[PDB]
Design a protein around this ligand. Structure first.
Ligand SMILES: CC(C)Oc1ccc(CNc2cccc3c(-c4ccc(C#N)nc4)ccnc23)cc1
Ligand SMILES: CC(C)Oc1ccc(CNc2cccc3c(-c4ccc(C#N)nc4)ccnc23)cc1
Lengths: 289, 39, 247, 238, 247, 289, 39, 49, 50, 39
């Protein structure tokens, strides 16, 4: 039954049991149900009024904290002779690059949420003059819009694209992107192929495509070079989640897929996820006095 | 505090205390009993 | 104008803050909601589902073999069959479980655990086992006469394939910590042991060796506190094709 | 009338004819753990009169050079009678204590004992960076002696120890002290082998003196656990 | 937008400020409260408890010996036995007391003090003492005929072991300061002196020398003001193992 | 009796007393009670209407002011050849390092409060170029979480750890940590051993473990070196306090224990806490005119 | 002023004027009297 | 066992009650003193101080 | 969050301004008032004296 | 605007228009008259 649960369940006192035909510790795992054996059935209990709150395990609280999704460093310099991110970069938006957020999200099959984005920028002098207070432009370039080819291309005039202009001395730039799947939920996993032909990508729902984040320095280059690093954080909010999954055990290999190899030896080897003990009779950290 | 015109701009909704774990723990068509053996 | 002053913490980026923020796409209309099976709203719903313990975490158990314990007929009475370390923070049989993997995002825990064992011998196999929980304070018991002084279930094999041992929450404090110091009095739970109560008795045309699968779940009195990054995942390099997202 | 007292608990009784009232620490009385404060869900054993009785420790000799004595609770009782057997078989324990301290001498003797119950008396070592070891702290029924009672062996002071629950034995005035201790812990129950809630301290702030013929003047300690509960039955650690 | 301007004091860290601040652990549930004996809510409850004066702060009094004053039979009438300096700010008998140690976190004080003396001779010892408080303005009295002009209690030894001398709050100002200038008219309290009223008289088999223990407390009219760092504690180096908290 | 007290008690006028059997200045210290002798009983008093407030001695006010708990200096430089805090540090959280807060807290046995934390950062040029406006990250790493090993290790991606990012030019960073003991109160003193074996630490309740504070500079190193100093302040608030104690007299020795030595000579020598006077008849600052 | 969702974020509670010093000054089982001698 | 601690004072005397602790309703005056129908146990006196 | 902007005069120290400011000594209780002869409340009372 | 907990933190009190200059100009025990000579 669906019910409102704010605290852990109370324990009732229980007596001795000796009833024929009543056998609450016996179960049948083959049904696929979990054991319904209560502690009051397994042992004699006392009454316990339980006050422990359950708010910290809410899916909202579990997922709605800001995580790094993108980090890029580029040279802020005169690029006339470079081969390179020439005072700007383009990022194809994804959540698979940083394993801590990736593993948390992949505990679920379908997710619906809005994304709070924070952009943190940092600058160092290339191998000192002090640090300049640069202006940056982040521009969202949706599917089928033209991405900028140059720091000063006219794409940056941004007539209809969302842009945010922000300083390095400011607090980190912050915006919310709405839930923008063409379905009612994002497909965290996708057992399918993106195209009507056979050559399309496995494992990525086309319905979930966000677009590109294009970031430039707005200033003309200075006489000396700098490295600029941009960090993007995403925080899910107003979250719905469906069909929880076995967590990732093996190290990730790629952002394109669930391909797996494991560590050379346990823990998280393909052959052994838990580290070995000497025998099933060995207690590894046994208390001895 | 939300002075933005779109409701998706709002702060997070941490008040949804509804649970139904039986859809994951007991998806059996005939519900289990305490006072009777499962099979 | 309004007179104001700025406090300490002005202009910081706290990753757990909760504010409204400027919508980048004005007048956007999200896709209507649709009912989907299996909505989860609290992670305590997940840990209440039972999942297999890797009890046979031994060398020469390979892959799936680590999820079952083999039982054989014995010629000595009341022998120990196996034990289970209960330290969820350290790398033992409980770690790669639903209750295990979710709890490791948290630092504090409270409430009861359920272990269920399914006997997977033939219909003709018979036997009785005793499953014992020992509250902490001393060594893990090695003899049945010592283990039966703790919380225990005597299990007769029969039509019902499974027993539960409840591990009751017996703790001085409201919570235990997922402490890498497993011998800490704030973290140690004690032990589970299995002994022969009678014997595994099988006829000639049944297989002489039979397996147990062990499961664990949290009960609905279970509670978790103080969120942390889980130590179960990491990276050293970038992943493959991550650089290509910038090209 | 406040000078005569009888304490009766289980099969044990103490009478004194020369008390000085008695102390109830922080105005509390021992009680069993209520349901709204319980943590452990197994049904507790409550042995009552088998545990809730006076145990008398070995007496110590008050000498002119005595620095004072201490006993830790529950440690000093952890091996005595049915109290000790229940602590050995159970993971968790809770109780109060009634402490009665006894010291008679003649009307030609003089001397004063500070009798004080110290909660969480975490000891220091003298003149070292190394923390006190297990065998420095855990003394059992014999208890220990003070190294530096003037700082209470903890770098604080004897002069301010009257902030803790105490009485005096002033040989002029009284020959016994009584202190009733509630459960005094941040957790509702504890593992009795690794944490001591209370330290009894007996300190001779005025030394024993007389000019009659000397006799041995013992100090005797009787401690009754009050409202003993035990949880987490298993084999004996022992 | 709201028009605003920033005032002086914007962005300062005042260590005594009182603001709400951003919670780092959202949805955290603290451990339920439990009743514990001995809750203190005002530090004036502590200073009302009596504690031993170190009246015998002399060389060749070692350790516990500094907490008692020895009284002997005299062959001259009305002799002075001891005095007590009352300057709580300076290092005298009152400093390492409950009232002393708490008051030294503060700069201003007001209200009455209680001194209690317990006689610890034998039952057979007898005697009368006079305990005198002298309001300030002149020298500490050295003769009983001078001291008895102040506030005094004549004390007969008997079944009741103790007398109190109340030191009443007699002050021109509402408060006194804990001033290192002890002769300042804003700080000096005057003196306590003890004389023989009759004599210490003991039989041959009682000890010829007897001790007083002196105690002090604040009364419930006592008040403290203007919090300061206490001069009773300091450090020069880091403590041992403090560096190791970073390793 | 428990009662609400806002001001010091009033004094009533008193008359001459001469009653047999009534002897209010006599007391019995051996009961352990403090003297109940009132001033109206000891002397003739006047009536005094007392207005002096008692709010400044409230335990809340006495303890709830910000105190330094941690101070660390490290080099912000290219550390490729260093032996050292290489652009970041880890602190095992404790309150025993700075004696002024330590002594105040140790006036009590049990304390329950929330902690307001302020982080103040300062920078100097190593032996001048001006001072850079660096971004710092403080990350709370609870018990059993992995601490960062490097300035740019992936631990800093902080998927579930609380992190605060803050600038040097900003006001000091401020957060509240909730009361987080697994008991109802912190154990300021602990007469026990942390483990089930005998070798565990004396004097530290395992229930009180907070975790680690890890602090890095987020910027890449500059061409020149800087020293960064981080100061952490803690302010208790919403305070409950139980069982007050004798204050510390002897200088502290260690953060691990209550070990004591004293000063060489009084005051606060092991043998003499108060400084000596010549005799019990000597008045040290006697007024003479 | 507190716009944070957790109540532990709040400013300090300086209004608790309840005292009971008798638990420290008079933990005697029979209360002392003014008009009668203690022993 | 069952005990009374006795302080000497103005009241000259203490009583130790020996309670009737018996499995049967009665005991026998048996010349076999070690018989389980007859043995009562022991009284002992020690110095407390 | 509240959208705001800063006006001219933000962050200035005008010596004749009139704001509340942060109390450095929380819960401090000032000395009770006492009646004193000769309270002056307007300086025009002084200039009326010859 | 005062969000501080201590009332001494407040802005200045510029509204006290009570005067009594006669305590400085006329502290004579018999008040002066207009219609009669002073001595
Ligand atoms: C320049 C400004 C004005 O616009 C911007 C700024 C930044 C961004 C970067 N956003 C984003 C970065 C990373 C992920 C997302 C997602 C997302 C997350 C998880 C899942 C799952 N499972 N699925 C989708 C949705 C929307 N956004 C995202 C986009 C537009
Ligand atoms: C990086 C940010 C987001 O998180 C942070 C930031 C800073 C900190 C440092 N906190 C802390 C530093 C020092 C002490 C504490 C205590 C504490 C105090 C006294 C007693 C006693 N008696 N017992 C516990 C509780 C919580 N905290 C503390 C922790 C997490």
């Amino acid at each position: 039954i669906e019910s409102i649960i704010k605290t852990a369940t109370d324990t009732v006192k229980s007596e001795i049991n000796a009833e024929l035909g009543v056998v609450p510790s016996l179960n049948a795992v083959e049904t696929g149900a979990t054991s319904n054996t209560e502690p009051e059935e397994a042992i004699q209990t006392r009454t316990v009024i339980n006050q422990h709150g359950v708010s910290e395990t809410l899916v909202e609280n579990f997922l709605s904290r800001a995580a790094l999704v993108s980090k890029r460093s580029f040279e802020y310099k005169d690029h006339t002779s470079s081969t390179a991110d020439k005072n700007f970069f383009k990022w194809t938006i994804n959540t698979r690059s940083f394993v801590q957020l990736r593993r948390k999200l992949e505990l679920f099959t379908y997710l619906r949420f809005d994304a709070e984005i924070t952009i943190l920028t940092t600058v160092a002098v290339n191998g000192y003059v002090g640090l300049p207070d640069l202006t940056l432009q982040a521009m969202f370039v949706p599917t089928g819009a033209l991405t900028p080819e140059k720091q000063d291309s006219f794409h940056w005039q941004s007539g209809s694209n969302a842009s945010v202009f922000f300083k390095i001395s400011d607090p980190p730039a912050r915006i919310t992107i709405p839930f923008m799947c063409i379905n009612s939920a994002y497909s965290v996993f996708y057992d399918g192929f993106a195209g009507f032909e056979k050559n399309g990508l496995y494992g990525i729902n086309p319905a979930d495509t966000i677009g590109n984040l294009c970031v430039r320095i707005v200033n003309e280059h200075q006489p000396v070079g700098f490295t600029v690093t941009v960090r993007v954080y995403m925080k899910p909010k107003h979250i719905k989640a469906w069909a929880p999954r076995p967590p990732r055990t093996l190290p990730y290999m790629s952002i394109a897929n669930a391909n797996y190899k494991g560590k050379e030896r346990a823990p998280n080897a393909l052959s052994a996820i838990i580290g070995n003990r000497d025998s099933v009779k060995t207690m590894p950290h046994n208390i001895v006095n | 505090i939300n002075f933005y015109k779109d409701s998706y701009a709002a702060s997070a909704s941490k008040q949804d205390f509804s649970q139904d774990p039986s859809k994951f723990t007991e998806p059996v068509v005939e519900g289990l009993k305490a006072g009777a053996p499962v099979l | 104008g309004v007179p104001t002053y700025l406090l300490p913490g002005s202009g910081q980026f706290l990753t757990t803050d909760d504010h409204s923020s400027a919508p980048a796409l004005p007048c956007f209309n999200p896709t209507p909601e649709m009912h989907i099976p299996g909505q989860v709203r609290n992670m305590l719903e997940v840990v209440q589902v039972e999942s297999m313990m890797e009890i046979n975490n031994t060398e020469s158990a390979v892959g799936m073999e680590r999820l079952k314990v083999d039982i054989s007929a014995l010629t000595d009475v009341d022998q120990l069959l196996f034990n289970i370390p209960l330290d969820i923070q350290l790398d033992g049989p409980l770690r790669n479980t639903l209750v295990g993997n979710i709890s490791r995002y948290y630092t504090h825990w409270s409430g009861s655990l359920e272990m269920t064992f399914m006997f997977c011998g033939s219909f003709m196999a018979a036997g009785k086992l005793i499953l014992c929980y020992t509250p902490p304070g001393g060594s893990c018991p090695t003899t049945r006469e010592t283990a039966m002084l703790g919380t225990h279930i005597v299990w007769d094999f029969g039509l019902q394939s499974s027993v539960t041992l409840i591990i009751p929450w017996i703790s001085g404090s409201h919570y235990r910590m997922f402490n890498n110091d497993a011998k800490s009095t704030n973290a140690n739970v004690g032990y589970v042991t299995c002994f022969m109560q009678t014997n595994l008795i099988v006829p000639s045309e049944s297989s002489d060796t039979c397996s147990l699968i062990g499961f664990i779940a949290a009960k609905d009195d279970f509670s978790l506190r103080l969120m942390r990054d889980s130590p179960d995942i990491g990276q050293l390099d970038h992943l493959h094709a991550a650089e290509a997202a910038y090209q | 009338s406040d000078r005569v007292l009888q304490l009766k608990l289980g099969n044990s009784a103490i009478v004194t004819q020369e008390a000085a009232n008695y102390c109830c620490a922080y105005g509390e009385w021992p009680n069993y753990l209520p349901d709204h404060e319980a943590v452990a869900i197994d049904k507790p054993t409550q042995p009552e009169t088998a545990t809730d009785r006076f145990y008398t420790l070995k007496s110590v000799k008050w000498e002119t050079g005595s620095t004072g004595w201490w006993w830790k609770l529950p440690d000093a009782l952890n091996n005595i009678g049915m109290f000790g057997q229940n602590v050995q078989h159970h993971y968790l324990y809770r109780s109060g204590f009634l402490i009665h301290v006894q010291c008679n001498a003649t009307k030609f003797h003089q001397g004063a004992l500070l009798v004080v119950a110290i909660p969480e008396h975490q000891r220091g070592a003298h003149n070292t960076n190394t923390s006190p070891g297990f065998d420095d702290i855990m003394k059992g029924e014999e208890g220990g002696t003070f190294n530096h009672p003037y700082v209470l062996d903890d770098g604080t002071s004897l002069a301010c120890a009257t902030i803790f629950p105490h009485q005096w034995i002033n040989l002029r005035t009284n020959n016994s002290a009584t202190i009733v201790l509630p459960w005094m812990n941040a957790a509702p129950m504890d593992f009795p082998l690794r944490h001591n809630q209370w330290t009894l301290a007996i300190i001779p702030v005025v030394p024993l003196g007389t000019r009659t013929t000397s006799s041995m003047v013992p100090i005797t300690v009787s401690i009754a656990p009050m409202c003993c509960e035990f949880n987490g039955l298993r084999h004996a650690i022992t």
